[PDB]
Design a protein around this ligand. Structure first.
Ligand SMILES: *[C@@H]1O[C@H](CO[C@@H]2O[C@@H](C)[C@@H](O)[C@@H](O)[C@@H]2O)[C@@H](O[C@@H]2O[C@H](CO)[C@@H](O[C@@H]3O[C@H](CO)[C@@H](O)[C@H](O)[C@@H]3O)[C@H](O)[C@H]2NC(C)=O)[C@H](O)[C@H]1NC(C)=O
Ligand SMILES: *[C@@H]1O[C@H](CO[C@@H]2O[C@@H](C)[C@@H](O)[C@@H](O)[C@@H]2O)[C@@H](O[C@@H]2O[C@H](CO)[C@@H](O[C@@H]3O[C@H](CO)[C@@H](O)[C@H](O)[C@@H]3O)[C@H](O)[C@H]2NC(C)=O)[C@H](O)[C@H]1NC(C)=O
Ligand SMILES: *[C@@H]1O[C@H](CO)[C@@H](O[C@@H]2O[C@H](CO)[C@@H](O[C@@H]3O[C@H](CO)[C@@H](O)[C@H](O)[C@H]3NC(C)=O)[C@H](O)[C@H]2NC(C)=O)[C@H](O)[C@H]1NC(C)=O
Ligand SMILES: *[C@@H]1O[C@H](CO)[C@@H](O[C@@H]2O[C@H](CO)[C@@H](O[C@@H]3O[C@H](CO)[C@@H](O)[C@H](O)[C@H]3NC(C)=O)[C@H](O)[C@H]2NC(C)=O)[C@H](O)[C@H]1NC(C)=O
Ligand SMILES: *[C@@H]1O[C@H](CO)[C@@H](O[C@@H]2O[C@H](CO)[C@@H](O)[C@H](O)[C@H]2NC(C)=O)[C@H](O)[C@H]1NC(C)=O
Ligand SMILES: *[C@@H]1O[C@H](CO)[C@@H](O[C@@H]2O[C@H](CO)[C@@H](O)[C@H](O)[C@H]2NC(C)=O)[C@H](O)[C@H]1NC(C)=O
Ligand SMILES: *[C@@H]1O[C@H](CO)[C@@H](O[C@@H]2O[C@H](CO)[C@@H](O)[C@H](O)[C@H]2NC(C)=O)[C@H](O)[C@H]1NC(C)=O
Ligand SMILES: *[C@@H]1O[C@H](CO)[C@@H](O[C@@H]2O[C@H](CO)[C@@H](O)[C@H](O)[C@H]2NC(C)=O)[C@H](O)[C@H]1NC(C)=O
Ligand SMILES: O=C(CCN(Cc1ccc2c(c1)OCO2)Cc1ccc2c(c1)OCO2)NO
Ligand SMILES: O=C(CCN(Cc1ccc2c(c1)OCO2)Cc1ccc2c(c1)OCO2)NO
Ligand SMILES: *[C@@H]1O[C@H](CO)[C@@H](O)[C@H](O)[C@H]1NC(C)=O
Ligand SMILES: *[C@@H]1O[C@H](CO)[C@@H](O)[C@H](O)[C@H]1NC(C)=O
Ligand SMILES: [Ca+2]
Ligand SMILES: [Ca+2]
Ligand SMILES: [Ca+2]
Ligand SMILES: [Ca+2]
Ligand SMILES: [Zn+2]
Ligand SMILES: [Zn+2]
Lengths: 535, 535
């Protein structure tokens, strides 16, 4: 579905203008979509400074783009209801040179188009282009493509689909709104000659014997073991015992020796392109309550020698002995290495140790809040319609308290999950501005792959506004101070606001595809950040 | 280990000269190494026609290259004993811009260098270069790299290594001479922006529900099932039951219905860049001896419409019900689709059917002769030192008969497999030239991966010669007519020549690694072809 003519190709970075007919929410959503391109490809964007060809993003009727570089500069429309990552990415893929997936030359082998069912003037979105106009880039037809329409697209009648797969199982798959597929990224790479990405700096799952170039020092008293997953209660996070002889983790045993004995595991040297990085990893702590996993940096001392130590974060064990997710903010601007120190506490009171798998390092912020809901498939059967779970309280960089409400069985949309966001009372509220407005909320359900290019995380975005009001609170703004608009909870000693978000955030059937529930548990990320400076 | 300065980079195709001080064997081995680059990368080579920078390949003392593009033209030496794929690939990687892996800036974290062991004048091969000269290309240190030296490299004393890994397990792994590693290909792609490759056209393992864009028509009688491997006593070829819920194959059952019922499985449309292609796949036929698996092409009829049928090959079931390898020559010069017809014969005498997995399509010749040795671990135990196996007799394009001899436990080299080539008598010998004067032999042990970029197949090359002579045949040429120089065999009614080959073709420990013995069986490819046209 890519345009064949090479003169229609861009030169990176693509220069852009955000028009003031976009709201703050759309400007913020566009910049968030640009970060996804940098993370997963070599595509890049710059602010406009008088270039010949450029993209101007505007609010017009509907959501549309031209296809390929129009050398005089060109519109992308992002209308009302289109300020979502997946829709921005689809329009940027039009501008990069891609038609819809149902517009492929071979599409009649894979789908039916019901021309009698398409609304007036939308039928060109269903045209098929010839092999002189469009390339396949030597890739198959992708039902999971972000460029593929959903069955009920521009239909006259809500009961009758416009597009259907010839094999009926794919009617549950076509028109995904998660992210780029693996074939969408492979096409993007083949068109623009990408190999690296601007923002994926490292990842490690420990499956090869060389453990991603990680090394073990001698200043420590002991070593980490590269451990095989071939024992009854010891399986790695990458495969969860799916695959014999094929899933590895690192282990540090704490059941023997002196207390305060330690081992260091240390990365290969890394060259950061930005000033901030997020280190994500998975771990278990089954040993003593006095064991300690400590994350460190070793950085250039300014001579070119990577030897300056800096401690970044400590982790300690509770009664939960399953796999946990960690995020560490690193702030490196010169070459450095990431380090894990496992430490024994009270070996005479330990029957276990420390475990590591699935490390990822990105040149991005870390998520502000992270929530893990355990045994989520059992919760999904034990919870009645409209019964709910609530997250622990999180604090943002500005000091505002917030949380998320999860309704596993939504009353408002049968067979869907409902995620809503609320503000929480917190220790700072007395000095913060109220109502909290112009703050973008990004909620993501994590697709648990260690390589970011494989991930299709579901994400939803809104911005806090004076227009958000409820009859339950005498028609006042939902985002006013939680002690006056919220309701008290013994679970956190909080007042929690009325909760805004999406009934129909994700389908239960979608939640059973990919890695949304990898170890029977659901991981949700939340960011809450001021975008007033984009106005 | 790559050179950082972008002015040292080549423009493709790299112009080359093969100098006439190279023998035929060396010229033929260089052209074979270029095919391996075109198969695994976007690197390309052209004959010289008056360009400014070019590579001239010559026979001088030792085997060496300059590093990066030298803009006035440069030598590669290929000396005596260096006419080997892996050695030629190593020199071409120097010209493309790579130093040895032990020359990385971080190398001291992974290896010990024993300077007092290095023979005089060779020590610069063991130098380490700074991060201003060289890039890591954001890659870990690779023990399995083609650019890494073996332990006994340029050593003064035959018992003492020059280089050792700091972790002793890798002393058995460093200095591999198979092929490019996965990291060496990743470095080459990052340096030159390769995404596609010139010669891999398709591959399919059937692991996704999309089945690599394969389609099933309705002009046939029935369909191929996409089958789950979750049935006892039946699994797929890709994973062989290693991995729960994972491994898929196509299945066509023949145990019910009418005879002559059929199913078509049909590829996506393909645009060949060359005039000849090879379709490799794996299959089983557990049904009736009257079942057929038939390979077809559907090709562009010159209107742009892919509707023209050509039958290419037929396969039928003997008493072996394990996975078999198959190769089909295709000669497509316009867009086409490759097709599998499964056909039922005698469903009242079938308890099984036809199975497909692991399809690969490349713009190459097919191998001239293919040998599968079954139960190879049990053969390797049950065969005494110097006892031998012999292949069926193959025929080349010119009509010469040939075969191979395998000595599973080599007497000459303990812990190695010895593999050798011989000329067989055959139906054409009366009109062929004798002795063989200039035919290159290529022998390959297949690393069984369906994606060619993941293979590290072991290969050896030599050219038949007037200098190959034996005391067993009164100092006459080994390659003279097999009825006058060979011994009669009841196994094929042939005369087989004296064999020539390599004691130490591969170690037993190397053979029990990667995918050389995937289903407890060994696959050997052989090619035997004239290179006199290079003189
Ligand atoms: C020894 O370690 C145990 C926990 O360690 C576990 O048992 C060992 C024998 C080994 O098998 C280890 O591999 C294994 O992980 C400690 O017991 C824990 O003590 C803490 C602190 O008192 C308890 O936390 C409390 O839990 C109560 C509710 O039960 C809360 O009300 C408190 O607020 C607090 O959170 C924890 O529950 C308890 N866990 C268990 C499994 O008993 C033990 O204290 C320690 N002893 C010494 C001498 O260090
Ligand atoms: C019916 O099919 C069998 C083989 O098919 C197998 O058995 C069926 C009942 C089903 O369970 C199938 O799923 C299963 O695959 C035929 O038997 C085979 O016949 C061939 C040809 O005669 C035999 O080959 C010969 O073998 C002898 C030595 O035994 C050699 O000397 C010959 O040169 C030749 O190679 C083969 O051994 C035999 N195999 C078996 C399993 O008995 C059978 O002929 C066929 N009958 C009909 C009605 O077509
Ligand atoms: C991704 O890499 C591709 C190569 O793998 C690039 O494709 C090449 O673009 C070259 C121009 O930049 C082409 O050279 C031109 O070829 C035409 C005939 O097609 C000649 O008339 C021109 O004179 C010639 N120009 C030059 C400067 O030599 C290559 O032919 C072409 N190669 C292939 C295989 O298509 C892509 O441009 C590049 N894409 C991006 C967007 O980076
Ligand atoms: C793969 O694509 C890369 C771009 O994504 C290429 O990297 C670019 O190489 C250019 C040279 O070919 C560089 O231009 C040079 O920049 C230096 C300063 O760094 C200037 O002094 C030079 O004058 C300038 N030369 C030219 C001809 O303009 C680009 O800066 C550089 N870009 C990046 C992002 O690194 C790779 O070369 C390319 N690799 C291959 C061989 O395919
Ligand atoms: C985006 O579309 C707008 C129209 O919605 C384009 O604006 C027009 O520009 C032409 C040529 O200058 C004028 O004749 C029209 O009067 C303009 N219309 C309006 C309503 O402004 C705009 O040029 C497009 N942007 C780009 C750069 O493609
Ligand atoms: C959309 O299509 C449905 C299905 O064809 C229509 O429902 C039918 O309505 C007619 C009367 O107009 C009834 O006689 C049928 O029994 C209905 N069928 C079903 C299955 O409900 C519906 O009227 C159409 N709506 C629109 C917008 O035209
Ligand atoms: C590459 O090899 C050729 C052939 O040996 C070199 O050409 C001559 O080499 C000899 C021995 O070094 C010199 O004495 C001659 O003066 C060389 N003649 C020339 C300049 O053509 C050639 O110098 C070698 N070097 C490269 C990289 O071209
Ligand atoms: C290579 O090194 C080996 C091992 O050091 C040498 O063998 C030793 O030879 C000395 C006499 O020179 C004996 O005293 C030792 O007992 C030998 N040791 C072993 C383990 O055999 C060998 O001589 C060296 N050869 C060369 C080429 O110098
Ligand atoms: O065709 C269009 C329309 C934009 N959009 C297409 C689309 C977007 C993401 C996809 C996808 C298809 O399949 C995979 O993920 C559908 C759409 C969404 C919300 C809307 C709306 C239209 O109208 C206002 O609110 N322009 O390109
Ligand atoms: O360093 C050199 C020397 C060439 N060669 C290096 C080498 C080649 C392939 C490799 C490898 C190392 O590690 C992975 O695979 C070793 C060599 C082989 C045969 C010879 C010989 C030298 O002398 C004559 O016969 N030039 O670059
Ligand atoms: C999940 O269920 C298991 C029992 O199957 C239980 O041991 C574990 O504590 C549960 N986890 C949570 C907190 O849901
Ligand atoms: C391999 O051994 C099996 C028995 O385990 C036997 O059935 C099969 O025929 C053998 N294959 C060959 C030809 O080596
Ligand atoms: Ca792992
Ligand atoms: Ca240590
Ligand atoms: Ca059919
Ligand atoms: Ca398979
Ligand atoms: Zn679109
Ligand atoms: Zn070398």
């Amino acid at each position: 579905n890519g345009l064949r003519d090479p003169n229609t190709r861009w030169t990176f970075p693509i220069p852009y203008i955000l028009a003031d007919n976009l709201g703050l929410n759309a400007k913020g959503a566009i910049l968030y979509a640009f970060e996804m391109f940098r993370l997963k490809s070599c595509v890049d964007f710059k602010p406009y400074e008088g270039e010949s060809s450029y993209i101007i993003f505007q609010q017009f009727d509907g959501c549309w783009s031209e296809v390929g570089d129009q050398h005089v500069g060109q519109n992308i429309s992002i209308g009302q209801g289109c300020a979502y990552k997946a829709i921005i990415e689809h329009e940027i893929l039009h501008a990069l040179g891609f038609y819809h997936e149902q517009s492929r030359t071979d599409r009649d082998d894979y789908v039916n188009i019901w021309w009698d069912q398409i609304l007036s003037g939308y039928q060109h979105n269903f045209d098929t282009y010839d092999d002189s106009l469009i390339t396949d880039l030597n890739t198959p037809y992708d039902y999971e493509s972000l460029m593929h329409y959903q069955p009920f697209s521009f239909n006259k009648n809500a009961s009758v689909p416009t597009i259907t797969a010839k094999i009926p199982e794919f009617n549950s798959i076509i028109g995904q709104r998660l992210d780029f597929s693996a074939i969408d990224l492979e096409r993007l790479n083949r068109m623009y000659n990408c190999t690296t990405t601007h923002t994926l700096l490292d990842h490690c799952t420990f499956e090869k014997a060389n453990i991603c170039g990680m090394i073990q020092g001698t200043r420590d008293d002991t070593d980490w073991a590269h451990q095989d997953s071939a024992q009854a209660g010891e399986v790695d996070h990458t495969l969860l015992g799916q695959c014999t002889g094929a899933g590895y983790f690192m282990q540090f045993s704490t059941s023997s020796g002196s207390a305060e004995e330690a081992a260091l595991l240390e990365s290969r040297i890394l060259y950061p392109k930005r000033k901030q990085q997020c280190l994500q990893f998975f771990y278990k702590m089954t040993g003593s309550p006095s064991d300690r996993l400590v994350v460190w940096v070793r950085r250039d001392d300014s001579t070119g020698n990577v030897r300056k130590l800096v401690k970044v974060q400590t982790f300690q064990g509770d009664d939960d002995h399953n796999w946990k997710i960690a995020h560490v903010v690193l702030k490196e601007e010169q070459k450095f290495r990431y380090l894990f120190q496992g430490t024994k506490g009270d070996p005479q009171n330990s029957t276990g140790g420390i475990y590591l798998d699935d490390i990822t390092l990105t040149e991005t912020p870390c998520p502000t809040g992270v929530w893990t809901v355990r045994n989520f498939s059992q919760v999904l059967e034990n919870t009645s319609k409209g019964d709910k779970l609530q997250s622990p309280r999180f604090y943002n960089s500005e000091g505002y308290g917030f949380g998320v409400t999860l309704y596993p069985n939504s009353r408002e949309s049968s067979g869907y999950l409902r995620l809503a966001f609320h503000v929480c009372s917190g220790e700072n509220d007395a000095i913060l501005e109220w109502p909290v407005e112009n703050r973008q909320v990004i909620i993501t359900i994590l697709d648990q792959e260690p390589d970011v290019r494989n991930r299709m995380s579901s994400s939803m975005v809104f911005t806090t506004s004076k227009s958000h009001t409820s009859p339950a609170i005498n028609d006042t703004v939902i985002w006013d101070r939680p002690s006056r608009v919220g309701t008290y909870h013994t679970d956190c000693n909080c007042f929690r606001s009325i909760d805004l978000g999406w009934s129909g955030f994700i389908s239960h059937q979608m939640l059973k595809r990919r890695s949304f529930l990898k170890n029977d548990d659901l991981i949700i990320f939340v960011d809450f950040e001021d975008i007033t400076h984009l106005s």
